[PDB]
Design a protein around this ligand. Structure first.
Ligand SMILES: O=C(N[C@@H](Cc1c[nH]c2ccccc12)C(=O)O)c1nc(Cl)c2ccccc2c1O
Ligand SMILES: [Zn+2]
Length: 230
């Protein structure tokens, strides 16, 4: 029942309940000659919502807000982008116009601006060093170190033991490290180890792309990324 690229059209967004108060948002986009699905996270905090990552571009992200207001009906008050690539900050302008307060680490904001990407308004402090963690709303934000990108963040929802890895974490179907132009292949396995050590009670793990799983996703990512390096 988890949506796939064939089941979502580009421009459409689907939401998928993972737990009480926790959803993923799945979108599709054309990129690098392909059509790819992409995952994000929605987390209820009272009668409010925290958005984790855009839906990949203005158009998708507006549909995301419109799907949310239809299917959930609570306002998105804040959004965090987990790294600087356009698939995660694209739509930040739409969120801002909708009234959403957009956040990212200072390094993400720097890298986004230098890339010509949209820039979240607010800076997240206390995430500058590998292994740093801060509470942000009802989730924890963790910088495991460089992986898919130097700046990528992962997000833990302790109330539901749900771990959102973004593109630092690979679905089980994945056999390659993906688009590694911006990745630190040398550091990524160590970064996945910091995730694994910090979240041993994670019950559901959501990769940046594809199907959810359990803690098996982390070791899979580590396997793939190590084999790539060697
Ligand atoms: O989607 C990305 N990468 C994926 C690709 C992938 C492999 N296999 C897949 C299977 C399904 C969906 C996506 C995949 C991955 O690296 O794993 C992606 N990567 C980079 Cl650097 C980007 C840079 C700038 C702007 C957008 C980007 C982006 O969307
Ligand atoms: Zn990326």
């Amino acid at each position: 029942e988890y949506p796939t690229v064939n089941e979502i059209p580009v421009g459409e967004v689907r939401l998928y309940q993972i737990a009480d108060g926790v959803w993923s948002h799945i979108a599709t986009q054309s990129f690098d000659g392909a059509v790819y699905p992409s995952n994000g996270l929605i987390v209820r905090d009272g009668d409010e919502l925290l958005l984790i990552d855009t839906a990949w571009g203005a158009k998708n992200t507006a549909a995301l807000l419109a799907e949310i207001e239809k299917q959930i009906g609570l306002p998105v008050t804040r959004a965090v982008s987990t790294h600087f690539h356009d698939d995660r900050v694209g739509g930040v302008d739409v969120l801002r116009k909708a009234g959403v307060a957009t956040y990212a680490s200072p390094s993400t904001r720097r890298l986004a601006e230098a890339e010509g990407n949209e820039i979240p308004t607010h800076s997240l402090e206390g995430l500058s060093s590998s292994g740093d963690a801060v509470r942000f709303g009802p989730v924890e934000l963790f910088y495991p170190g460089a992986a898919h990108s130097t700046d990528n963040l992962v997000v833990y929802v302790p109330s539901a033991n749900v771990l959102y890895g973004g593109x630092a974490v690979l679905a089980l179907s994945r056999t390659s490290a993906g688009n590694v132009a911006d990745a630190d292949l040398a550091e990524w396995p160590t970064s996945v180890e910091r995730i694994q050590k910090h979240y041993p009670e994670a019950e559901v793990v959501i990769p940046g792309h594809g199907l959810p799983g359990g803690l098996d996703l982390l070791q899979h990512t580590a396997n793939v990324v190590t084999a790539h390096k060697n």
